[PDB]
């Protein structure tokens, strides 16, 4: 009864830690999904960046040779 | 010192360097981000492991609190309600019981 009051105190300390770890899990899980999305954008753009670069290498040699 | 203080193709040169630095910086970001992503995933397993054990303990706390609270409720308990309660408390939670 007073034990029950000690138990409510233990519940309160526990509930704050539990809500923190639950939101921390969500924030960590969100950061991982955000990073994977960022990875996917860079990975998807990597051919496009490679495509542009290859054209730029062809453009570099061609435009120099034409002006030469 | 005096003379040097007074003292098309540049854009072609500067643009290929500019684009390649874009590629390399994006590439290094990709490599480092993948490693960091695996580190966060491994850390997430430690969070799940630690919180998972606490969730099990939290259920135990709710059981003793709710059962004694229902027992505290203003109705006369039967004798079997008392015996089953202390059997449950003593057997399931011997450490907390003592």
TrEMBL record, chain A:
The chain holds residues 338 to 405 of 809 of the full protein. Belongs to the GCF family. This is GCF C-terminal domain-containing protein. Residues 11-45 form a coiled coil. It is found in: Nucleus.
């Amino acid at each position: 009864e007073d034990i029950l009051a000690k138990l409510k105190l233990r519940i309160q300390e526990r509930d704050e830690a539990l809500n923190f770890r639950k939101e921390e899990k969500r924030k960590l899980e969100q950061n991982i999904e955000e990073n994977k999305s960022m990875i996917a954008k860079i990975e998807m753009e990597l051919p496009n960046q490679s495509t542009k670069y290859t054209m730029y290498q062809e453009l570099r040699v061609y435009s120099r040779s034409l002006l030469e | 010192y005096d003379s040097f203080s007074m003292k098309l193709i540049h854009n072609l040169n500067l643009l290929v360097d500019l684009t390649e630095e874009g590629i390399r910086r994006s590439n290094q970001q990709l490599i480092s981000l993948k490693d960091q992503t695996t580190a966060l995933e491994y850390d997430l397993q430690q969070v799940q492991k630690s919180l998972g054990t606490e969730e099990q303990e939290a259920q135990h706390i709710k059981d003793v609190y709710e059962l004694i609270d229902g027992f505290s409720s203003n109705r006369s308990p039967s004798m079997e309600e008392c015996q089953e309660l202390f059997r449950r408390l003593r057997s399931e939670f011997p450490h907390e019981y003592e």
